[PDB]
Amino acid sequence: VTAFVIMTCIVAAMGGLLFGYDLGISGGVTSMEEFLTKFFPQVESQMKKAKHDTAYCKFDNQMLQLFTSSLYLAALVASFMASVITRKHGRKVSMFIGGLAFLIGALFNAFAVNVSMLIIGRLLLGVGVGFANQSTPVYLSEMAPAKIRGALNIGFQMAITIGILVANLINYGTSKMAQHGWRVSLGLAAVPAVVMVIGSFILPDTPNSMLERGKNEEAKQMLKKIRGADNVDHEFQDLIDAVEAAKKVENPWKNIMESKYRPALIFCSAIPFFQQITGINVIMFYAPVLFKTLGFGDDAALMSAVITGVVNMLSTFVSIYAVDRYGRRLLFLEGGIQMFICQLLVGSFIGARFGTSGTGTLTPATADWILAFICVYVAGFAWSWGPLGWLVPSEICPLEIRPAGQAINVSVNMFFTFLIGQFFLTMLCHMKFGLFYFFASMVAIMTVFIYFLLPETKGVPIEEMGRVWKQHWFWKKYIPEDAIIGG
Ligand SMILES: CCCCCCCC/C=C/CCCCCCCC(=O)OC[C@H](O)CO
Ligand SMILES: CCCCCCCC/C=C/CCCCCCCC(=O)OC[C@H](O)CO
Ligand SMILES: CCCCCCCC/C=C/CCCCCCCC(=O)OC[C@H](O)CO
Ligand SMILES: CCCCCCCC/C=C\CCCCCCCC(=O)OC[C@H](O)CO
Ligand SMILES: CCCCCCCC/C=C\CCCCCCCC(=O)OC[C@H](O)CO
Ligand SMILES: OC[C@H]1O[C@@H](O)[C@H](O)[C@@H](O)[C@@H]1O
């Protein structure tokens, strides 16, 4: 491990900020009266008569769901495009496109003068997210020394949570603007894109992609540079071995369903789905809706998005320290147990305080204990399914289908991000605390799934990952002998 490989992965992980900024900023902007009046005067015309509501709760009308989904549709579709680009031209090439498309969408939003620029900036933001999220995890996983691959991979997620936090702070400040606050909120999304774009000019590409697309001596020089050694023959042989197999495959989507890829295929699909049916993107807004409904500051709701975002970042550090010293399984099991227990605690706490005879017992101290319970649940997510949701699919895919496997990860995730968060929109807004129990069972299901089916992937060089599957009960019947590289 060199100072060069470290700085390279830090600079590449900054692509998480794009997704993170957008996740953090859109809740505040949508509550801004000046922004609603411009683009959705029908929402404003009933926010005017609500006072105790949250505006994004009325994005339940058919045309409003269209506008919301368009970003996830664009990202879902970009991510497949980026599978092809990333393999054909290299990982740093999809990262460039991700930033540049995100930049273009940011200025379109910040300078929108009607609802068609907003759509167009929203389509573009999602293209940015499909490319950034499809290729940055691949880049990190392949560039990092195997010893610390998980730590340097999670920096992508660390960046996502920094994006979430920073956006929430921005919204808090621009919300106290006489005019154009929403333009600042959307417009500052352009700083991370410029950073990502400029960065992509300076990053090297992975020797894995370099060797796979013909640049041989260039691949070994880059391996010797990031590893800092001259005797890279050993792991360069793993690369030679894998490119030998991978260069027999063109159109990885043709062979994706072959038996030797079944483990990676299953997990590239279930891990994104599970990450969302956790309910993280429903539960993260229970407290601000609740706070606003029951009186309490408009500020108070935004203040609790900051507190959660401070907890959501920072918790990330736990996964970063633990993931390579003790593994992925530990974080998956502990994180799920913790998340399971907070969901039962908060579901029943609400169900008690506001349910015996009648309904309606507003309380400050009761509101803070629900936020503490959610924060511990968000912490358990933040060092399990959060980061592990962008680490594990990237590190279980043989070279020829790695980019395609990351695209399955992004597309399934965006599809379910939108689907779960829109389906649960009504219950979240009408304070149906039964959702915490439902999300409890899913966390139970997914924790059991993980326990039995996911082998430990820590410490293994990326191209040797088939030995791990072969040494797992159950999955071992899928992996042919010729798929085990380096031992
Ligand atoms: C109020 C304005 C504030 C503006 C805020 C600007 C945000 C800066 C971006 C940071 C990307 C962070 C991602 C880097 C994650 C690095 C952690 C890591 O990857 O691990 C290191 C490894 O363990 C070593 O041994
Ligand atoms: C490395 C740094 C890169 C720099 C990244 C750029 C920063 C983006 C900020 C954008 C804010 C846009 C503010 C525009 C607000 C003026 C809008 C206006 O005045 O128009 C009113 C409208 O027409 C009424 O109908
Ligand atoms: C080596 C790695 C170091 C590990 C670093 C880990 C840092 C994670 C911190 C988590 C805080 C979770 C506790 C949740 C805080 C509750 C906040 C709250 O309840 O807010 C109420 C507020 O007062 C209403 O107004
Ligand atoms: C080019 C690389 C891949 C690009 C992938 C593109 C695929 C997604 C396309 C459209 C998403 C849906 C867009 C439809 C948006 C309609 C918005 C709207 O109708 O807003 C109404 C407003 O509320 C007034 O009432
Ligand atoms: C990985 C190491 C294993 C560690 C396992 C930890 C699991 C914790 C489970 C439930 C905590 C629920 C209790 C949350 C404590 C919140 C304290 C708090 O601050 O709430 C007080 C409130 O702010 C005043 O009104
Ligand atoms: O930190 C919170 C975020 O973590 C990411 O890993 C997930 O993909 C996001 O949906 C989530 O909102």
Author numbering: 21 to 507
What does the report in the manuscript say about this coordinate set?
Arabidopsis thaliana STP10 is a recently characterized member of the STP family with classic STP traits. Found in growing pollen tubes, it is a proton driven symporter that displays low μM range affinity for glucose and can transport glucose, galactose and mannose. A key two-step process in apoplastic sugar import from the phloem is the breakdown of sucrose by invertases to glucose and fructose, followed by transmembrane uptake into sink cells mediated by Sugar Transport Proteins1,2. STPs display significantly higher sugar affinity compared to most other sugar Major facilitators (up to 1000× fold), and have a broad pH optimum compared to their bacterial counterparts.
The structure was determined to 2.4 Å resolution using X-ray crystallography, and the final model was refined to an Rfree of 26.8% and includes residues 21-507 (of 514 residues total). The overall structure adopts a Major Facilitator fold with 12 transmembrane helices (M1-M12) divided in two domains (N and C domain) with a quasi-twofold symmetry perpendicular to the membrane plane. STP10 is in a substrate bound outward occluded state with the N and C domains as a clamp around the central binding site. The central transmembrane binding site is located between the N and C domain and contains unambiguous density for glucose. The C domain creates a T-shaped CH-π interaction from Phe401(M10) to the main ring of glucose, while a large number of key polar interactions mediate specificity. Asn332(M10) is in contact with the hydroxyl group of glucose carbon 6 (C6) while a hydrogen bond network made through Gln295(M7), Gln296(M7), Asn301(M7), Asn433(M11), Thr437(M11), Trp410(M10) and the main chain carbonyl of Gly406(M10) and water, mediate the contact to the C1-C4 hydroxyl groups of glucose. The μM affinity of STP10 for glucose can be explained by the substrate’s interaction to residues in the N domain (Phe39 (M1b), Ile184 (M5) and in particular Leu43 (M1b)) that creates a hydrophobic interaction surface for the substrate. The Lid domain, a fully conserved feature found in all STP sequences, is a protrusion of the first extracellular loop (M1 to M2) and it is covalently linked to the C domain by a disulfide bridge (Cys77 to Cys449). Here we find the only two buried charged residues in the transmembrane region, Asp42(M1b) and Arg142(M4). The distance between Asp42 and Arg142 is ~5 Å indicating that the aspartate is in a protonated state.
